[PDB]
Design a protein around this ligand. Structure first.
Ligand SMILES: *[C@@H]1O[C@H](CO)[C@@H](O[C@@H]2O[C@H](CO)[C@@H](O)[C@H](O)[C@H]2NC(C)=O)[C@H](O)[C@H]1NC(C)=O
Ligand SMILES: *[C@@H]1O[C@H](CO)[C@@H](O[C@@H]2O[C@H](CO)[C@@H](O)[C@H](O)[C@H]2NC(C)=O)[C@H](O)[C@H]1NC(C)=O
Ligand SMILES: O=c1ccn([C@@H]2O[C@H](COP(=O)(O)OP(=O)(O)O)[C@@H](O)[C@H]2O)c(=O)[nH]1
Ligand SMILES: O=c1ccn([C@@H]2O[C@H](COP(=O)(O)OP(=O)(O)O)[C@@H](O)[C@H]2O)c(=O)[nH]1
Ligand SMILES: *[C@@H]1O[C@H](CO)[C@@H](O)[C@H](O)[C@H]1NC(C)=O
Ligand SMILES: *[C@@H]1O[C@H](CO)[C@@H](O)[C@H](O)[C@H]1NC(C)=O
Ligand SMILES: O=C(O)CCC(=O)C(=O)O
Ligand SMILES: O=C(O)CCC(=O)C(=O)O
Ligand SMILES: [Fe+2]
Ligand SMILES: [Fe+2]
Ligand SMILES: [Fe+2]
Ligand SMILES: [Fe+2]
Ligand SMILES: [Mn+2]
Ligand SMILES: [Mn+2]
Lengths: 700, 700
């Protein structure tokens, strides 16, 4: 049994990047002893991401190995650091090294790189990997010194070619007992083997398994174009996220805060923008520490911004509006906003927030800052769907792809802080990072690629992780796809596409409490119920939309009311069909009035069918009253839309068989009474002003 | 001006017949002085109704005229009496006689009778009547004596031929100044002039006008086959019936009573016979003075007679039943019944009453006896129609005909006691008349003519008036036309043909009071009303009819009830359609339930449409309960059909939204509640016995 105190891990790292730090954490988890070569030095090994190079590693390792040239008691494993994680213990590692019978075991990979012609010189291996990879090897310090001491080439010469040629010397391969880990018992290179690697979960740690060879590798190497696949595995392996411990590096359970530049982007017509702008005043972060930048690209939203701007200017430290008249593209506005923070050394954090992001968690900005990441996004999802503001994987084209764990993350089956290839709509970036690692202005622009993808590609090219937290519930994403802007109040038509936000804006705030009991619902007349249904904003916008149409009913107009053996009881009104709001209003009936009626009339069942839905206008100068009649409905819904006293004087609804009068209606409240046989009723005359009501004859 | 004290009317009458008495009344009305010749003598003038004769009148007049052979101061008018009425005063009569310039004025008629060949010998008259009639003449006593003294022929020789031949002597016609009343200024003979005579009304008397000659005759002579037309006129002229005085011989405004033989005839299956038989016990006449004879021709009615007979035998003086097993024809039974009274000198009055005659006036028999007529019938009419138990006129065939005043009599625009040609269904005949004037047994039989017509013809042949009183409301006539006897209780199906009698038998006695207010209707649960609808007999017969059908509902049977989003709520029941009672039950709904629902739910209007009408049977051993549900109706009718306690133990109807229970239903009473939305309800389990209810889902 080889003593783990005799094992030393050597790696190379010119800077403490997130990948290197991820490597060290995995090393410390298993109590590995790591020696890092080359910190602070300038990397002269060339663009190893694009071509060959890396000889500076061999030079640095050769110098280091002269100390141990005679240390036959020492085992050394050289590995990369930026794209390597450790999945197994030193004890298991040494046990497997001894089992190999090798004196210097190199990792094996599928490709013969960089010289593909040398493939013939390699020994024939049946079913395992055949060729050498220089990203990881392990052997006796004496044997390794005899190999690396022969380095005498340029810092930008290829390291793997150097080891390959020495390994292809049959006499040297035999003299020193060199070997390759063909079946990935110790080293797992990802390039050319993605379909062979799966995560193997344990209670408080995660590994990988090679299903081709049925092994559990110690070293996971995201070599070549597999950095993002290694990013995925590194979210779990070895103690990233565990079934019983949860994530292993997030905050989990949570004097001046850092100054922040908040950039808000309005790049398309988006619903509920006044609500979004009002919410900015409610973000739980000291506003004197926040500078606001708002780019509005829509003339449709200029009135919305204008209404909010006095409150925003009075609220935040400083404000800046870039309107549609600047003719800025989205990529130019986002480059501008980010560079305003980049060129300001007092900007410690950049917070980018799009208009379709609804932050229900007012502590979002705090939470993300405490995570102490370079880049981090809150997970936002569209209500009741899988679509959200991040990607778990990339197609080969670098386009959208669904990761293996995407649904688990979106459904918050697994929560934590996740290294992901793409984020959007909301993210917090460290100002230091913009100054030191992404100093260019063309972050979102510069190519024909979509700006939000160029942004993410810009950071992946620099080795900057893009983090995503679902540790908390942060909010949701508005549907903006086909937002019909040709209305006086377009958000009235948003009941289908954005129902949660529609309910918060238009359904009465005390509606849901009334539906749960709690003694809000009243019964002013025997079988006539009274409950809050619409908010004041819904009433005001519906009335406005009606008057904007203008074409109220006149003579010859017929309604479905029964009085004295006749249906000749008309009202001056507009039907929802005329204004194209019937489908929308029928949805309100199914979702909100139906369940209320079944609660108040136990035993009755409804699907809220209604052919007759209309807004009535009473006025002393045209039609102020409505004579006694029955409704052609099983039950009738009657919603007030303005204020008695302020907007009109005059009575409301009289139920004759009960001598019971609703004399003081309440604005967003609805009456619910039977339509036939029992509740013969009358609309009392409006004597001053104008009285609006919304009526539906449901279940005719 | 000729003194009316010089005028003497002479007529002939061997018996004080109704026609003679009618003549004398008209004579006394105008203060005429009448000398009647031949009373008590045997009539030897032959059958003047069938052929020639009447010379006995001329012989009797000749003897009488010898007293006045020299009385030039005296004017004498000879007229018939049995078929003559006087329509004018002696003063007007003498004024017209003088105006004629005649010394002996004979009446004129259209026909030259009895020798038609003598027509050529008559003077030519332009447009008036040409030939002589011996039924009336007026002249000086000296001139008349010179004519009648030449009589020397047989008692059965023709009187009119005698006068005609003397009138056709041109020298004698000239010597004595004989004339004919060509234009009916004084005498109106009806034969051949019916289309010329109309009634002329005054305030307190009635005349006739000749529209051909525009005259007002003094004497109306129903000569030949016009006796019945004279009967019609005699109902008015001169003071029979007047617009301001009413009838002039009826009682108008009304110690042992006469003994009566009451003969009841059941010659066809007739509805409501048990009610008819029960009514016999309620006729307001001392039953110890009444003998009952009942002829039942229908085996269908034998059980009905059997049930009633103990009460009838105990009630009346004596009773006699002739059943179907005697095989008596209607004419034989009516001959038998009438002859039982005829051969019994203690029978002072005969009262014949048919089973389809409903006497609503329990004083009928008294009223008719007080009228002191030989024959008299109460006017009975079929409800809401003109058909009734008399004819006003006869066709030439002696068949049915509508008289000019028939509708006025049936509608009781004119009331009185009327001389009519035909009566039926109910009449009171003086026993003396049967003994002395109609002694034959074959009154209804003897020919192929219908028995009821033979009866009336028998009396008209004897000169017996058939009287009809509409002076009071006496009753009605049942429709018996198509009485469907193939039912367990056929009278249940009589709602159309006999609705007044159907209502009295089957509709609850206190229903109509409840419909007029009076605080019978109850409201045991909020909008659930409770009123009496059916009588106990209706409930018992409907249940019996249901059990007699027997085929109650079982598994797989579906009803129109809504519970928990489903229509799977069945009852063990029978639908009215299955037993062929739906049309009948829908008529009950329209007539009785509809108007009640409109009274209790002001504003609602109904035509009582119902596809779902059925009787439910609850039993502990099959289906004792009915789970909570809604009804597929605007409102629901729910009628109990038996007694809680006596017939079943267990609850009734529970309305869940009100915690209101109808725990003690009342038999013929009905519940009336809404069917939808508000009155979710349950049928509580029947724990002992059997519970029947009648349900209708009206206005679905
Ligand atoms: C919803 O209900 C709350 C509480 O029941 C209402 O709040 C009250 O508002 C009145 C004036 O409108 C105040 O006088 C009370 O003090 C408030 N009570 C509380 C507990 O805050 C609220 O107004 C209701 N919402 C709407 C739209 O009517
Ligand atoms: C119709 O109403 C009358 C009176 O309202 C009912 O007669 C009463 O009957 C009860 C017993 O049933 C007696 O105790 C009372 O004395 C009666 N009152 C009178 C004024 O006679 C009659 O029962 C009702 N008819 C039906 C079929 O229920
Ligand atoms: O600027 C650099 C680039 C490279 N490296 C080290 O050199 C190794 C080789 O780089 P890379 O993993 O990107 O090459 P690949 O494995 O894809 O061939 C990295 O893991 C780092 O340990 C470094 O220290 N500084
Ligand atoms: O039995 C009789 C029949 C006849 N008359 C009288 O004779 C008249 C002639 O009879 P009738 O009127 O029937 O003959 P007609 O007018 O039809 O020729 C009657 O009016 C009676 O006055 C009579 O006294 N006894
Ligand atoms: C690592 O070493 C420390 C002693 O410094 C020990 O407490 C810890 O349990 C070790 N961890 C493992 C995984 O062996
Ligand atoms: C008939 O005579 C009486 C006198 O006895 C007289 O009172 C009556 O008014 C007279 N009637 C007529 C109609 O002349
Ligand atoms: O005026 C009211 O509140 C009642 C109006 C009404 O009942 C109707 O619209 O049919
Ligand atoms: O049992 C009862 O009285 C109620 C029965 C009922 O409601 C029905 O027949 O539908
Ligand atoms: Fe309308
Ligand atoms: Fe209404
Ligand atoms: Fe049924
Ligand atoms: Fe029911
Ligand atoms: Mn590498
Ligand atoms: Mn005559």
């Amino acid at each position: 049994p080889v003593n783990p105190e005799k094992l030393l891990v050597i790696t190379v790292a010119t800077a403490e990047t997130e990948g290197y730090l991820r490597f060290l954490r995995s090393a410390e988890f298993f109590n590995y002893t790591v020696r890092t070569l080359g910190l602070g030095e300038e990397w002269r090994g060339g663009d190893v991401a694009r071509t060959v190079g890396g000889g500076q590693k061999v030079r640095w390792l050769k110098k280091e190995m002269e100390k141990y040239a005679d240390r036959e008691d020492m085992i050394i494993m050289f590995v990369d650091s930026y794209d390597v994680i450790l999945a197994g213990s030193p004890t298991e590692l040494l046990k497997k090294f001894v089992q190999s019978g090798s004196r210097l075991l190199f990792s094996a990979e599928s490709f013969c790189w960089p010289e593909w012609g040398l493939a013939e010189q390699y020994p024939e291996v049946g079913t395992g990997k055949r060729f050498l990879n220089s990203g990881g090897f392990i052997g006796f310090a004496t044997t390794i010194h005899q190999i690396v001491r022969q380095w005498k080439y340029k810092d930008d010469d290829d390291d793997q070619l150097f080891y390959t040629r020495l390994y292809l010397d049959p006499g040297l391969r035999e003299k020193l007992s060199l070997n390759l880990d063909h079946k990935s018992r110790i080293f797992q290179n990802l390039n050319g083997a993605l379909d062979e690697v799966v995560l193997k979960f344990d209670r408080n740690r995660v590994r990988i398994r090679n299903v081709a060879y049925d092994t559990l590798p110690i070293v996971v190497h995201g070599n070549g174009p597999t950095k993002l696949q290694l990013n995925y595995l590194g979210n779990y392996v070895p103690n990233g996220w565990t079934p019983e411990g949860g994530c292993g590096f997030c905050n989990q359970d949570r004097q001046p805060p850092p100054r922040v530049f908040l950039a808000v982007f309005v790049e398309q017509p988006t619903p509920f923008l006044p609500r979004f702008l009002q919410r900015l005043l409610l973000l739980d972060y000291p506003p004197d520490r926040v500078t606001l930048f708002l780019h509005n690209n829509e003339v449709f939203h200029e009135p919305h911004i204008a209404d909010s701007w006095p409150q925003l200017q009075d609220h935040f430290s400083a404000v800046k509006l870039v309107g549609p008249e600047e003719a800025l593209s989205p990529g130019e506005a986002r480059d501008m906003a980010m560079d305003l923070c980049r060129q300001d050394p007092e900007c410690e954090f950049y917070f980018s927030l799009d208009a379709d992001a609804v932050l229900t968690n007012l502590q979002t900005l705090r939470i993300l800052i405490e995570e102490n990441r370079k880049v981090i996004a809150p997970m936002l999802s569209r209500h009741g769907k899988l679509w959200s503001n991040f990607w778990g994987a990339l197609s080969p084209d670098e386009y959208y792809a669904r990761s293996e764990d995407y649904v688990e993350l979106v459904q918050r089956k697994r929560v934590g802080v996740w290294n992901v290839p793409y984020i959007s709509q909301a993210y917090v970036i460290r100002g230091d990072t913009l100054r030191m690692e992404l100093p260019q202005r063309d972050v979102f622009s510069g190519s024909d690629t979509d700006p939000d993808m160029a942004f993410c590609k810009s950071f992946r090219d620099k080795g900057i992780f893009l983090h995503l937290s679902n540790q908390h519930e942060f909010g949701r994403l508005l549907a903006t796809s086909r937002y019909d802007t040709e209305h006086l109040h377009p958000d009235l038509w948003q009941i289908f596409d954005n129902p949660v936000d529609w309910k918060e804006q238009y359904i009465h705030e005390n509606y849901s409490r009334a539906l749960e009991g709690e003694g809000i619902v009243e019964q002013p007349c025997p079988d006539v119920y009274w409950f809050p249904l619409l908010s004041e904003q819904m009433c005001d916008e519906l009335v406005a939309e009606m008057e904007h149409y203008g074409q109220w009913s006149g003579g010859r107009h017929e309604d479905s009311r029964l009085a004295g053996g006749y249906e000749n009881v008309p009202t001056v009104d507009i039907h929802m069909k005329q204004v194209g709001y019937e489908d929308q209003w029928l949805q309100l009936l199914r979702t909100y009035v139906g369940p209320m009626t079944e609660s108040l009339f136990p035993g009755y069942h409804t699907k809220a069918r209604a052919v007759m839905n209309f807004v009535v206008r009473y006025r002393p100068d045209e039609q102020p009253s409505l004579r006694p009649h029955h409704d052609s409905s099983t039950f009738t819904l009657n919603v007030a839309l303005n204020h008695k006293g302020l907007d009109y004087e005059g009575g409301g609804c009289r139920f004759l068989r009960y001598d019971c009068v609703i004399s003081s209606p309440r604005k967003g409240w609805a009456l619910l009474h039977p339509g036939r046989l029992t509740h013969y009723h009358e609309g009392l005359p409006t004597t001053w002003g104008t009285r609006y009501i919304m009526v539906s004859f449901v279940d005719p």
